[PDB]
Design a protein around this ligand. Structure first.
Ligand code: A1BVT
Ligand code: A1BVT
Lengths: 305, 305
């Protein structure tokens, strides 16, 4: 039945996006209840971004200096405060489109959908993973700051990411909705390096399981292995160490396919040592690591919202 | 700045999805104004699907045999008619969430977003192309019939696809919103073959342009070529013949990058003849053909809706 990088339906998040302007800097905000959340660097000019003192810069800013626009409607700002690297603008109107929602700080390797926005308007939606070095490989242009990443369970939106910046390498960094960056990055235009980008081994395994479910079976080999033997191979190829929590989380996929997790590890090992020989798996010519075990099950079982 | 398979924001389509039941068969419908559209095979049992006489089967069906459910609300069916392979159920209530919309029949090689639905509820969204053999490579499970593909321009939804079936090969077939299948397929459970799946050459070129825009430049070679010389190579590799309309449509990407279209063709030629040598382009280890020139420009310029 096929296998795609599938994002969550984005309508619940679309109705929360607004445009936030301060002076001559415009970006996106997220309007939930009577609070608008946005990157605190909305208060900065280009000259500020080289070395900003946010507390000093914010002192110069009153409620009426923040223009918040929801579609055509202008919201009245009655309060502002900085929480870590986000600003929270209190407005006089609760968003009537507020979904049920939560703020969550995800773990590296987990995935989420991004609704890329410009000027408070949605442009498109795609699925992403938090990399082990805490960057994301997104698609973001100037003006995209404030766009949000989320997951949806039934009717509840779990916001996990707010986009802040592009690194000089072209990968992306940002915060949770409490304003704490993922990773060591800071909201300053200085060179910052990400660290080694390793591969999310438990996600690769899940996708191999997905491939078996879908009939792509050529890579299944005759071998098995051990957790320590496999991790010797993982380390050599900059794969994340596989732990017993990871084996456990793969239990349902192992059960569905009748392939023991350590057998699948030995197939992955042989793929790492021998490459793919010009073949493909689920239409990809490399090992994909942006599907979690839950994504695989969710997609292969038709979970809805 | 990165490059992703990006779908359109799906909220406008979410509020049109409903569940349609007839006897013991349930699938999705699309509720626009006071009409619900769905695959006519909603009227079939398993035994029917082997060789259905739809006109005969429909005679047995009255307005009250179609149960249409919108969220929890039950819609009152006051009219039904078959148009090619879709049913149109007239209901007594206009959808209040009806967006501006159009029905369009797309050309092979064009792309669109799919909102995969089960029981009238959205599950996820992803981008797709109509393949040259008129199949799509989707992600669809039992119950997904009736899910729709669309494009969005500003505020207008252009519906282009309604999912009907999976072929024995695991690829997907369906109709436009007038009920006419893409391709030679019929809504019967008989073996049907798709034809040779060729590669959408103008889309590969666009994505190569995208790669240059994003800094991935290693594949640019010293050669140029001619349209006839290139097409000799395209035919050998099951690539669609490139025409002068295609060259024309690539004009803005050529202008942005300063790379003449025929020069990019010679780089593609060398990639087809030499492979990729274990390298990657925009994070892919094969040549991607599911981005149109408009998708590339749209993504690389931040068009919103
Ligand atoms: C609406 C957002 C504009 N904004 C800004 C920016 C924000 C406030 C004031 C100014 Cl003066 C600039 C970016 N900056 N600049 N230094 C930065 C240091 C720390 C954090 C962000 C930084 C920034 O990186 N981005 C981009 C994010 N993602 C992808 C991009 C692709 C191309 C260009 C910019 C991108 C912004 O969009
Ligand atoms: C809600 C849809 C159920 N429906 C049906 C179906 C529809 C009406 C009556 C019955 Cl009795 C079956 C499928 N059928 N069956 N013969 C078919 C011949 C022509 C057209 C469709 C056909 C069908 O292919 N699909 C699948 C579509 N896409 C992916 C699938 C993956 C797994 C299983 C089914 C899938 C349906 O979901």
């Amino acid at each position: 039945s096929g296998f795609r990088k599938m994002a969550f339906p984005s309508g619940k998040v679309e109705g929360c996006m607004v445009q936030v302007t301060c002076g001559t800097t415009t970006l996106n905000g997220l309007w939930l209840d009577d609070v608008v959340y946005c990157p605190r660097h909305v208060i900065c000019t280009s000259e500020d971004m080289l070395n900003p003192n946010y507390e000093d810069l914010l002192i110069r800013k009153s409620n009426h200096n923040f223009l918040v626009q929801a579609g055509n409607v202008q919201l009245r700002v009655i309060g502002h405060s900085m929480q870590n690297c986000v600003l929270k603008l209190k407005v006089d109107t609760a968003n009537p489109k507020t979904p049920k929602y939560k703020f969550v700080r995800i773990q590296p390797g987990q995935t989420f959908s991004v609704l890329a926005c410009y000027n408070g308007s949605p442009s498109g939606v795609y699925q992403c993973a938090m990399r082990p070095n805490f960057t994301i490989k997104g698609s973001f242009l100037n003006g995209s700051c404030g766009s949000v990443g989320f997951n949806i369970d039934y009717d509840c939106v779990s916001f996990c990411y707010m986009h802040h910046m592009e690194l000089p390498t072209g990968v992306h960094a940002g915060t949770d909705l409490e304003g704490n960056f993922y990773g060591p990055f800071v909201d300053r235009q200085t060179a910052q390096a990400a660290g080694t980008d390793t591969t999310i081994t438990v996600n690769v395994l899940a996708w191999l399981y997905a491939a078996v479910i879908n009939g792509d079976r050529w890579f299944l080999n005759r071998f098995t292995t051990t957790l320590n033997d496999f991790n010797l191979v993982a380390m050599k190829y900059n794969y994340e160490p596989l732990t017993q929590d990871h084996v456990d989380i793969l239990g349902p996929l192992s059960a569905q396919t009748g392939i023991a997790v350590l057998d699948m590890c030995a197939s992955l090992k042989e793929l790492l040592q021998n490459g793919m020989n010009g073949r493909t798996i689920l239409g990809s010519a490399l090992l994909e690591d942006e599907f979690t075990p839950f994504d695989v099950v969710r997609q292969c079982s038709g979970v809805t919202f």
